[PDB]
Amino acid sequence: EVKIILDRDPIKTSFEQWAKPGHFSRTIAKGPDTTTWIWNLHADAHDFDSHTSDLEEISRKVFSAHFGQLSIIFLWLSGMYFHGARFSNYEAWLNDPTHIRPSAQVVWPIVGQEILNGDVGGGFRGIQITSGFFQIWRASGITSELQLYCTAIGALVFAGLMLFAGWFHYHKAAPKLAWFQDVESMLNHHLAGLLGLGSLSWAGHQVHVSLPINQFLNAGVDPKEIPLPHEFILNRDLLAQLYPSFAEGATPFFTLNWSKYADFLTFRGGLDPLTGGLWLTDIAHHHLAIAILFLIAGHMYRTNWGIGHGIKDILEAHKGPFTGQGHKGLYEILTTSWHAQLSINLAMLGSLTIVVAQHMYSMPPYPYLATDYATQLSLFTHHMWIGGFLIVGAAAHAAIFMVRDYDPTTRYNDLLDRVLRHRDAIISHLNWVCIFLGFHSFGLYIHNDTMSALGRPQDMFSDTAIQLQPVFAQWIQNTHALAPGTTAPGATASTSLTWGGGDLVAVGNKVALLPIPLGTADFLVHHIHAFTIHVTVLILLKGVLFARSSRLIPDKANLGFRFPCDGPGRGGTCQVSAWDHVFLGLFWMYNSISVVIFHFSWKMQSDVWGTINDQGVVTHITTGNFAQSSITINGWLRDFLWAQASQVIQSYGSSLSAYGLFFLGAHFVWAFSLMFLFSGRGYWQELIESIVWAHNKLKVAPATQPRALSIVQGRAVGVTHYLLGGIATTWAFFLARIIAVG
C-alpha cells in the first residue's frame, strides 16, 4: 500500500442546526417534555460515537475538536502574555526578582475589591501570581512589555488559524478514514516532526537569545541597556565576546572533532548559585540531544519506501508460552477504536504530568523559581491534580472500550482474553494487597497515636524509638551523590541538590534547595502513597475487567457503560456499572493526591525552605518538626492543619482575603455535595410533586415538566462538588499560607 493525502469536498455549513437543540441525537432532537432533556443535551454533546456509527464521521469530529481546543489554548496564552504587558510589574521584577512579588492582574475599584491590589512591590498594586510566567519570560530573554505584547498578538493570530483550520477540516476538506489510520506515518511525524524539530527549534532560541541575554542579567547590567536579541544574530561580535566558540561558523560541527562548543554547552549539572535555576548552558545542550534523539526515532516505521517497520508485524511476533498468540490483532483494535487510544494516552499523559511535578521542584529549571516558594508549591500541586485526573479518565475509556468496541468474533486479541478469563484472580489479589497496605501504613499511625496518648513515646514507630528507616531509597540517594566523577565522569556536580549531601544553594536570604533527609516519617507517608494508589487502581481496574459481565450480572454489557444499576434485586445492584467505578475512583484519587500534596507542603517548609543568613545558620519555616510530628494523625491535625491554616483565617482586611473567602466558600460547596451523595432522587421527585402543585394552583406551572436529577447525574453532581469543594479549599489554604509566610 502507499500512504497519501486523502480528503473530501464541502460537507455543509449553516446556522440552521444552531437553531435546533440536540440535533446530533435522534432521540433528543424532538425537543423537551421534561427537564431531563436539558441535562442529557450537555452530557451527550461530546459522545460522538453515540451520535453516528460511521468511523469516518467520528474521526472527523474529533479532529476539528482538537483544532477548537488548540484555538482556546492559543487564546489563553495570548491573554497571559497580554496581561504581562499591560497589567503587570514584570519590568520592575526584572531588576529585583528576589524581593518584588510577581503580579499580573489589576482589579477595578468597585464595591471595595481594590483591597485585593496589595503591596506586591515595584510601586505596583495587584494580585500575586503563582503561574510562574515571570521566570519563563526572563528565561526566554524577554526584556520589555513590547515583546510580551508582540507574543500576545502572535498567539491571537495563531488562535485564529487553529479555529479556521477546524472549520476547514470538517466543513471544507475532511480527512478520510484511511488517512487517520496511517499510524506508522503519524508516529513518525510526531516523533520527528513535532518533537524533534520542536526541541531543535527551542535549542536555537536558547543559544541565540536566552543564553546571551541571561548572562547580561546575571552580570547585573540594567535590562533596558541589554542589546535586543537580534543584535546577537547580526553582529556575531557580541555573541563572540561572550561564548567565544562562535568565532568559527559551522566548524567544528561540520568538521566534527567535537567540540570547542563546551563553552556554551556542558554537562555541568546541579544548580546555578546566582539564579537558583538549572544551568541554561545545560538546558540548551539538553534540547540538542532531545532533538537528534527524536529525529532518529522518527524513522522506525515503514511508509512508502519499504524501509522501516510495520507495527502490525512487530506486535504479532511477540508471543510467549504464557500468553498465547497474544499481541496479534492489537493493531486492528488500536486503529479502529478511538476510546482504546484515548485510554492509553490519558494514562500516559497523566503519568507524565506527575513526573513533571516531581522533576520541576527537585531540579528548578527557570531562573529565580526555586526561592519563589509561592510558585513552586503551586506548580507541583497543579500538575499533581492534572495528572491525577487524566489517569482516572484512562479508566473510564478503557471501560467504555470494553462495553462498546470489544468484539471477540471480529477483533480478537488473546492478551485481552485470558485476562478476562481470570479477572477474579487479579481483583481478589489487588483486594488483598490494599488491605495489607492499609494496615501496614495507616495502622502504624494509629499505633503511634495511641502510644503517644498513653505516654509511651518509646513504643512508637519513630526515629527515636522503633525505627523504620527507608534504607533502599537512602542507598539510592547516596548513589546519586557519588555519581559525578565516579559513575558519570562527565558530570561535574550532582543531578539534583537533594542528592548533594554537603552542598547548599541560596538566593537572597532564602534557601533554593538542599539535600532532603529521609527517615521513619518518610517511610510511613510513602506506604500511605503506595496504599492509596493501589486502592484507586483496584476500583478502576475492577470496573474495567467486570464492565461486560459478572456472576451477579451475566449481561451487564447490554445495560451499557453508564447506567444507575439493575434494581434492588440480588440483594441490590447499585453502582455495578463501570461509570460508577470511575465515580468511586474519583474520590480515591482525591484522597491519594491530597495526602501527596500535604506530604510535599510540610516536607518542604519543614526540611527545605526557610531563611538563611551569612553565618550559615539555616532556619526552616516550620522548623524541622516533620520528623517527630508527621508520624501521628494528631500531629497532622495540629502542627500542620491547625498551625498553618492561621494565615488564611487571618487574611480578612489583607490583600489575601479572597483566599479567606474561597476557603469558606469551598467548605460550603464540599458539604453541599453531601446532599446529593447521601440521598436519592425518589425523595426529591416527590418533594417536587408538592411544589408543582403550588404552581398549578397559581396557573404558573411550566410545560417542561420538572424532574429530579437522574440517579447517575446525582452522583455526577455530587462527586463534582465534592472535588471542587475539597480541592479549592486546599488551594485557598495553600496560596494564603505560602504567600504570607514565604
Binding site: 444552531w18 437543540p21 464595591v111
Partner: protein, 41 residues
C-alpha cells in the same frame, strides 16, 4: 438570519440578560456606593 437570531434567545438570552443586569447594578454602586439605607424617602 432568522436562524442566527434563533441561536440567540437560548440560554445566551440568560447571559445577555444577566450581563446587562450586572452592568446596571455595578454602575448604580459606582454612583451610589456603600448604601445601607434608602435615604430619600
Amino acid at each position: 438570519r432568522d436562524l442566527k437570531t434563533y441561536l440567540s434567545v437560548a440560554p445566551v438570552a440568560s447571559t445577555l440578560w444577566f450581563a446587562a443586569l450586572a452592568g446596571l447594578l455595578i454602575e448604580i454602586n459606582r454612583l451610589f456606593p456603600d448604601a445601607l439605607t434608602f435615604p430619600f424617602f
